Amino acid sequence: RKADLTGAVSVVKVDEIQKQGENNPVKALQGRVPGMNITADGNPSGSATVRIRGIGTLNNNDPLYIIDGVPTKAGMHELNGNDIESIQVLKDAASASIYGSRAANGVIIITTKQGKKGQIKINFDASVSASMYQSKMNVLNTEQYGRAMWQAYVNDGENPNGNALGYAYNWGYNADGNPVLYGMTLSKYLDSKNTMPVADTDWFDEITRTGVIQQYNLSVSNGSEKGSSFFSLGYYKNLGVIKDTDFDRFSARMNSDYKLIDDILTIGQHFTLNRTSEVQAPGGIIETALDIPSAIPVYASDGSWGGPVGGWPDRRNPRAVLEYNKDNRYTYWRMFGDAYVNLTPFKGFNLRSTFGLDYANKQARYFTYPYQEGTQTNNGKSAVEAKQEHWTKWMWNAIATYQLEVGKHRGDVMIGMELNREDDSHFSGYKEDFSILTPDYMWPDAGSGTAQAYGAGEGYSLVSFFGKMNYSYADRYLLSLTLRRDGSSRFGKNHRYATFPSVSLGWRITQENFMKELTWLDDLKLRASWGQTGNQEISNLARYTIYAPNYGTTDSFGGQSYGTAYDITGSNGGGVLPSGFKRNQIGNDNIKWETTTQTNVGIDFSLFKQSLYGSLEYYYKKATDILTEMAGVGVLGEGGSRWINSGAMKNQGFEFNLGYRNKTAFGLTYDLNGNISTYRNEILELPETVAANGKFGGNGVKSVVGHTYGAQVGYIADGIFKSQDEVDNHATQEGAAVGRIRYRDIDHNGVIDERDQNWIYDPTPSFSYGLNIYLEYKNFDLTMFWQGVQGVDIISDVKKKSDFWSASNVGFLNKGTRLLNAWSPTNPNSDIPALTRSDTNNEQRVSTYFVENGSFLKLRNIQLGYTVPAVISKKMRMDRLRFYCSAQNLLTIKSKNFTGEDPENPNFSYPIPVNITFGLNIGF
Amino acid sequence: GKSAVEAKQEHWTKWMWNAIATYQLEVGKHRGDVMIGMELNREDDSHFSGYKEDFSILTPDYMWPDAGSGTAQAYGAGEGYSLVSFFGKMNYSYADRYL
Amino acid sequence: FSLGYYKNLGVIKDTDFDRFSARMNSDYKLIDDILTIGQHFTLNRTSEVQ
Amino acid sequence: DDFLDRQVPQGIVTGDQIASPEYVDNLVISAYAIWATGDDINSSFSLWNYDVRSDDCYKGGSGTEDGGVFNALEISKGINTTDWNINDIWKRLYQCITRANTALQSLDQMDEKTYPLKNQRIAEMRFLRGHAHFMLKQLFKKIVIVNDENMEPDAYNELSNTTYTNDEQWQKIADDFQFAYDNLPEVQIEKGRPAQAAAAAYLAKTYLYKAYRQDGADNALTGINEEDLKQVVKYTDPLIMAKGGYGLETDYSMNFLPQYENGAESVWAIQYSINDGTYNGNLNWGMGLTTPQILGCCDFHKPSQNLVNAFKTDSQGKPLFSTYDNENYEVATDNVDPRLFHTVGMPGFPYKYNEGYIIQKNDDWSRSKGLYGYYVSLKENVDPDCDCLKKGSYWASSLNHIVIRYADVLLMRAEALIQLNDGRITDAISLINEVRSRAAGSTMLIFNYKEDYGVNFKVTPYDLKAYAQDEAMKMLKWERRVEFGMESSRFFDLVRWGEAKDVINAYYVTEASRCSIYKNAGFTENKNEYLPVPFEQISASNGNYTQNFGW
Ligand SMILES: OC[C@H]1O[C@@](CO)(OC[C@H]2O[C@@](CO)(OC[C@H]3O[C@@](CO)(OC[C@H]4O[C@@](CO[C@]5(CO)O[C@H](CO)[C@@H](O)[C@@H]5O)(OC[C@H]5O[C@@](CO)(OC[C@H]6O[C@](O)(CO)[C@@H](O)[C@@H]6O)[C@@H](O)[C@@H]5O)[C@@H](O)[C@@H]4O)[C@@H](O)[C@@H]3O)[C@@H](O)[C@@H]2O)[C@@H](O)[C@@H]1O
Ligand SMILES: OC[C@H]1O[C@@](CO)(OC[C@H]2O[C@@](CO)(OC[C@H]3O[C@@](CO)(OC[C@H]4O[C@](O)(CO)[C@@H](O)[C@@H]4O)[C@@H](O)[C@@H]3O)[C@@H](O)[C@@H]2O)[C@@H](O)[C@@H]1O
Ligand SMILES: [Mg+2]
Ligand SMILES: [Mg+2]
């Protein structure tokens, strides 16, 4: 039963959601909803990014979740997802407008479990899983690194023995004169102090482990003709594949409802309290592991952490970084409550008053230990940073609803007044100069150095007056009209309030009397909708010209702190310097709501007595007056960025969902749920400065207007040179040589320059599809979910560090294994450019070489279960006893054009492991 | 002319786990209750504060540690304790007269 | 299920104390008399100027 | 309905309150802080990153890829208008300009009687704005002259770099310096604030740069203006400098030592401080990359062998005008100017006058494994045991960056007198002799080298007699080269003199043997003497910004 019945609403089967055994319920439905993309890195937490109906605005695109009627935007990884009874995604503006003023990016409606009338249920779910690291990037070992360095040296024509890295090469020339390597030897110690012995270290294996996931849920549900209740407890723990990274969560939910008199005075509440403790991986840990050469030992001769010495590249020890980061644990208390009262003066009138609260409290204590890894050190700096953050949101809602059933005319009239009110704050203390260097001793009182205090606060409010009218004739013609008047504190008084209408029409064709002979066609419905929604998800301080006293106490990398503190006297400090103010942004009093107009046309069908069901949707979204933060013109200086309504986005999309469930003669019940979706995104208008800086695409070379959001312009790589004749015949370019990348001459001017660039990257897949298969046979249930993406291109940064030598900022870094298969006179059958120590050709430029085909098809979740026969369970007094074994991310298929691995995560983000899970469910 | 802000945060977290085994008997006029119990109590407290000076507008809206321009101080401490208990209780009643 | 609001302005000026409170208690009996699972929770928010 | 109106900005000041009279002084301090906190490692206000194009130094780091854009600038090949460093330095300099403009706008709306120091503060702010404009003009020939503090932001889109010609832009830059000279006090109790002497010296420098006319579409010298040279001579008079108590230091090294900050020769410097309530202190983060490998990382700003050979002198104490670069300098058999050991740290010698650190030709002092040599710049570096050096993810010190030195004033006066050729060459010769005499006596920390490393010092002043204009100009060029090495002014001087192309080509040819990075280097006659206008800025302001000639 859809909550709108006349809009683009997707109902997710919650039973299949819990099968995947994911902490985040949103991550579970990664590819089960058409036109809704979920991207998850693979960290122990269930944090993921959601994009509904593509990219719809130049602002925050997270959809508005609704739990028990209370809206929010925080991720669901911090809430217990095992007590959800229904999930509905409202991807249509007309249908989702009535649920809030933040519905521009879509609304996901989540309903929690409630006690079923007249019965009691208890469910205990246990789950133990092992997560294994699968996407192991192949990097050069010691011998391979030496061979690659020798190849680069001989290709450049330099002496390979001058590497000054302890490698001594015995080599010569063949009959054709091409250099050949006979053998290599290494010095025992990398430094003259004999403190860093040479070793063959697998850094990826050193920093990875086999994670353990535990999940225990216990829920009890109570129903009656007269009231109901529900109490759930949950514990989740996930150890990541990366060492010293973990995430655990305790959860307790209590829901209840009471009916007084006979039917009047229905008072209900839903509350949940969660406590999540997490240690996250340091930024660029995978990059650090990939960059550091395998010759560096984990431990030095004296037992301290190993590190680069002499001429080895400056990279920290990833194991040491993980060890020092294991104490950066943060605790997060989440609190989602709601209490509502419903009054019924007579049969058709309802008055609902609702109060919802969301309180979040985050406490963290970060430590900075002194480290000395060879030549890598922080000058013995030890510090503590105690940070506290508070978020407090509350919403009050009043709803008046009237229903009439006059003849064949059904009429629902609803009005509503809503207030939303959010306040955020944070403050932190910073201390230095510690002695014991242990988390027990590192407290700000125990410090003996410079101290810093940081602190800020913000907030906003929203007011909404909405109305909804639904008319039904003969249960065949449906009309819906909703109107919203929304105001926010982020806008000035003149442009505070805005009006948004939406209309929906629906015709149940099967109800018409002219096709009663079509017995096979069980149900057919055609619906259309045209709606407008408002977007105001911008910075709270958007219309003010901000001047802030930035003294410079905040840590900055590179010294570009832009602080306001100058030693005007010239005494080299020694006290409190005079300070001032700096401009952060220029105010704009003409900012108003961004208007997103959505037109949707859908056809729902069901054939063969509800056996073959499905839906087909086509949508057109047009966002105008987009509140974008334009940067300064360049001579406007600091604080030149300002918010302006100068945007325009278009999204044209198709979605198709199908489902076929049927039994078999010998007792097999098969259910197939297929889904496919495609969309095209375009930017029609954009501010000149925004298009110039290329923050939304174009790389600052060409304007992204008229092209897909995020599209990138680069050169075109027409293979590599294989002879001097090819270099001479090709158009002249700097650094052209044998074995170097050849770049196409777009304008045919005879010279390769910055004007020889074109659109090369389009981050829009041709189509994304999913398929769920459920088989039941003799108490055996098998679930198999496949997700595929076709026609998507990806920019690969790992390729830049695997197909080239000395293509990074610093040289002598560790590279990929496939680098060994580079072009050479001895090995002409290769497309990888020849190794070189100098990037004369400038191959780090954006080009089609780094663009790879990201199409993939992976088995997201497979599960085989066994249900104990009812007689044995009744003997053991359990109403339902089930066991199951599942595999998540077990298998994947990728295109041959993708040189790397894991097309879903082709970069240095958190890896996605393979989960092998065993679980049991008891229904006492 | 001293102006300053002091942002203080304190956390207290206590949890107790209890296990009780109770048996009751009603043999004739003899009533007997035997109870055993194992209890764990576990308390952790912490606090930290930041101190800033040299403010200009001198209003609560403007007084935040980031808006200060003077000497800053950081204070912080933590503590905790645990308790373990094994207890037993026996109640005997004769004729509902002798306890 | 109980909700409560209290506010007290002291006789001394600029001193006050307010408190919001929400309590939810429940108990459930399974089978016939075995497996009695219960809970009592209360959440309070007190804002005070002393 | 007060539901949406209770809430106000937290911890910030709105734009309508920044004009209050009690904040203006704060804003003034802001205009100075941007000169010490607004520079990154890759974009410093000393402009050493863009001085690698000259013959004084290479680019440090692990290799060419470490700052590929800067390597392309150094070799003058493969330079694209869509480079991040050019746009970054443009944006940072204009950020300084607009901070100064905001302070000026705040100052201009205040009563003179209530605020007696209004004129002095306005003069200081004009001086800072003119300094930023001058550095932009040096980097880019065509710049936008933002000299209107009372300009609305919406009008900033209507500005253009072709509104004024080159001469008009130079005059607009010099107007601020003229106002500052007319309004600044003779002596400043606070060393951070510029004095009248600094304004006069910088105005003379601006007029000297204006003298070498760059009329026409191309960047070729089209003549020397006599009026500009007369103005230079007028504004460089020794009476003005002596009125402010400025003069050459007794020892050269005191210009680059923490113990002698804000000295007599320090006409105006950026005040860098440590232990001042900041997270790491207002250190010179722009020079953080320049620290040697012994200090830990990045080994940038390595002086070239050409400069070391230039420091070599003959038996008569004069620089080798034609045979200096034929052979590498030898410590045992070649007389050397003492200024070399205060500028370049050669292997086998103490590092920053510290006997405990000896520079060696190994990986402990070179990051590129000999690709960029083993020489270490010393002017911006400090002793490792200074206690003025702090590790803030980049080794930076509190040593002041001296923008204007009295030796610079003397050399500009000598150059103006030589170019005038109005029977006053002997005064320029006397100034050069004074500079050389100051250099000769600068052996208070390197005196023992003669008895420790066999170093022969031989510097003598030129004889006072009649000199031809070309010979005197050559001697002035040599004195400038040997006096302001590592100080990031060689390329600008070459561009101003109009001989940048020939000198750069000769340097490339000579150093291609000892440095492979110059294998394919090449300098264009009318394209590589000025940084191109960033492509992002031109795209942002369509039909208003014109690219420099040759692009
Ligand atoms: O802005 C648009 C466009 O510009 C890009 C294009 O590259 O960068 C420019 C942008 O980046 C900055 C950062 O402030 O400059 C980077 C730029 O500077 C160069 C030289 O030109 O390198 C400078 C040196 O910095 C080092 C120093 O590394 C360490 C780490 O702290 O410092 C200490 C010494 O005190 C040493 O012990 C350490 O090695 O590296 C910093 C540089 O390294 C980067 C770049 O890949 O990543 C390396 C990180 O990987 C880790 O493993 C994970 O943390 C770490 O070990 C390491 O930090 C990046 O994080 C840092 O910027 C040293 O290696 C260099 O010699 C160039 O190499 C570099 O390109 C800005 O100045 C400038 O605006 C992009 O940002 C963007 O597309
Ligand atoms: O991130 C910018 C923006 O986020 C806000 C608004 O909630 O708060 C986020 C703060 O969390 C910070 C570090 O403290 O990073 C986020 C990490 O903290 C976690 C903890 O669960 O997330 C907190 C917060 O972000 C979501 O996860 C986003 O959906 C929400 O579910 C949750 O409420 C964790 O998920 C992240 O790793 C940092 O970004 C912010 O301080 C604002 O404070 C801030 O403006
Ligand atoms: Mg071309
Ligand atoms: Mg100083």
Numbering used by the authors:
A (entry chain A): 93 to 1016
B (entry chain I): 472 to 570
C (entry chain I): 323 to 372
D (entry chain B): 2 to 552
What does the primary publication say about this deposited structure?
Glycan uptake across the bacterial outer membrane (OM) of these bacteria is mediated by SusCD protein complexes, comprising a membrane-embedded barrel and a lipoprotein lid, that is thought to open and close to facilitate substrate binding and transport. Here we show that for both the levan and dextran utilisation systems of Bacteroides thetaiotaomicron, the additional OM components assemble on the core SusCD transporter, forming stable glycan utilising machines which we term ‘utilisomes’. Transport-competent FOS are generated from levan by a surface-exposed lipoprotein, a GH32-family levan endo-glycanase (GHlev), while an SGBP (SGBPlev) is thought to recruit levan at the cell surface. Single particle cryogenic electron microscopy (cryoEM) structures in the absence and presence of substrate reveal concerted conformational changes that demonstrate the mechanism of substrate capture, and rationalise the role of each component in the utilisome.
All SusDlev lids are closed, tightly capping the extracellular face of the SusClev barrels, relative to the open position in the apo utilisomes. FOS1 is found at the interface between SusClev and SusDlev, and consists of six β2,6-linked fructose units with a β2,1 decoration on fructose-4 (numbered from the non-reducing end). A second binding site (FOS2) most likely consists of four β2,6-linked fructose units, and is bound at the bottom of the SusClev cavity where it contacts the top of the plug domain. In the apo structure, this region (SusClev loop 8) is mostly unresolved, likely as an artefact of masking during image processing, whereas in the substrate-bound complex SusClev loop 8 contacts SusDlev and FOS1 via F649. In the substrate-bound structure, W685, which sits at the base of loop 8, shifts inwards, nudging F583 up and S193 down. This in turn results in a downward shift of a plug loop containing S193. In the apo structure, Y191, which is part of the same plug loop, forms a triple aromatic stack with Y89 and F558 that links the wall of the barrel (F558), the TonB box (Y89) and the plug domain (Y191). When the plug loop with Y191 shifts towards the periplasm, this stacking interaction is broken, resulting in release of the N-terminus and an ~35 Å shift of R93, which in the substrate-bound complex is the first visible residue. This would plausibly make the TonB box (D82-G88) available for interaction with TonB to disrupt the plug and generate a channel for substrate diffusion into the periplasmic space (Supplementary Discussion).
